[PDB]
Amino acid sequence: MQFTPDSAWKITGFSRDISPAYRQKLLSLGMLPGSSFHVVRVAPLGDPVHIETRRVSLVLRKKDLALIELEAVAQENLYF
Protein backbone atom coordinates (compact mmCIF):
# COMPACT_ATOMS: atom_id res chain seq x y z
CA MET A 1 0.00 0.00 0.00
CA GLN A 2 2.87 2.41 -0.90
CA PHE A 3 4.80 2.41 2.39
CA THR A 4 6.57 5.73 1.79
CA PRO A 5 9.47 6.46 4.23
CA ASP A 6 8.27 8.48 7.29
CA SER A 7 4.59 7.59 6.63
CA ALA A 8 2.99 6.66 9.96
CA TRP A 9 0.37 3.92 10.37
CA LYS A 10 -1.87 3.10 13.31
CA ILE A 11 -2.58 -0.57 13.99
CA THR A 12 -6.39 -0.84 14.42
CA GLY A 13 -6.59 -4.64 14.53
CA PHE A 14 -5.52 -7.75 12.62
CA SER A 15 -7.01 -9.39 9.51
CA ARG A 16 -9.36 -12.39 9.81
CA ASP A 17 -6.51 -14.13 7.91
CA ILE A 18 -3.72 -13.90 10.56
CA SER A 19 -3.12 -16.96 12.75
CA PRO A 20 -3.03 -16.38 16.55
CA ALA A 21 0.59 -17.67 16.61
CA TYR A 22 1.91 -15.05 14.12
CA ARG A 23 -0.23 -12.35 15.82
CA GLN A 24 1.48 -13.13 19.19
CA LYS A 25 4.92 -12.78 17.55
CA LEU A 26 4.11 -9.33 16.11
CA LEU A 27 2.48 -8.23 19.40
CA SER A 28 5.69 -9.11 21.31
CA LEU A 29 7.56 -6.79 18.87
CA GLY A 30 5.36 -3.74 19.69
CA MET A 31 2.75 -3.99 16.89
CA LEU A 32 -0.14 -3.30 19.32
CA PRO A 33 -3.61 -2.17 18.13
CA GLY A 34 -3.90 1.53 19.06
CA SER A 35 -0.12 1.95 18.61
CA SER A 36 1.60 3.61 15.60
CA PHE A 37 4.71 2.69 13.61
CA HIS A 38 6.85 4.67 11.15
CA VAL A 39 8.23 3.37 7.85
CA VAL A 40 12.02 3.78 8.08
CA ARG A 41 13.08 2.48 4.65
CA VAL A 42 11.93 0.19 1.82
CA ALA A 43 13.85 -2.39 -0.24
CA PRO A 44 14.72 -1.62 -3.88
CA LEU A 45 11.85 -3.45 -5.73
CA GLY A 46 9.51 -2.28 -2.91
CA ASP A 47 9.57 -5.37 -0.64
CA PRO A 48 10.33 -6.04 2.17
CA VAL A 49 9.47 -2.99 4.37
CA HIS A 50 11.60 -1.75 7.28
CA ILE A 51 9.67 -0.06 10.17
CA GLU A 52 10.07 1.08 13.79
CA THR A 53 7.72 0.66 16.81
CA ARG A 54 7.89 1.96 20.42
CA ARG A 55 9.73 -1.27 21.31
CA VAL A 56 12.01 -2.13 18.36
CA SER A 57 12.74 -1.90 14.64
CA LEU A 58 11.59 -4.84 12.45
CA VAL A 59 11.27 -5.97 8.81
CA LEU A 60 8.43 -7.78 7.12
CA ARG A 61 6.98 -8.20 3.65
CA LYS A 62 3.94 -6.32 2.30
CA LYS A 63 2.16 -9.69 2.35
CA ASP A 64 2.91 -9.79 6.15
CA LEU A 65 1.62 -6.20 6.59
CA ALA A 66 -1.59 -7.22 4.74
CA LEU A 67 -2.46 -9.47 7.79
CA ILE A 68 -2.74 -6.30 9.95
CA GLU A 69 -5.53 -3.70 9.75
CA LEU A 70 -3.60 -0.45 9.30
CA GLU A 71 -4.92 3.04 8.83
CA ALA A 72 -2.97 6.04 7.68
CA VAL A 73 -2.56 8.47 10.55
CA ALA A 74 -4.17 11.26 8.50
CA GLN A 75 -4.89 13.61 11.42
CA GLU A 76 -3.57 17.05 10.49
CA ASN A 77 -2.26 17.96 13.99
CA LEU A 78 -0.56 14.49 14.07
CA TYR A 79 0.81 14.61 10.47
CA PHE A 80 2.81 17.79 11.27
**Structural domain contains residue 34:** yes
What technique was this entry resolved by? X-ray
Resolution in A: 1.6
> 38: closest CA among 55, 24, 17?
55
* Overall number of domains in the chain: 1
- The kind and range of the H/E element at 49 are strand 49-52
Would you state the torsion angle of the CA atoms of residues 53, 4, 71, 38, taken in this order, to the nearest 10 degrees? 10
**Structural domain contains residue 51:** yes
Q: What whole-number distance in Å separates Cα of residue 79 and Cα of residue 68?
A: 21
**Structural domain contains residue 50:** yes
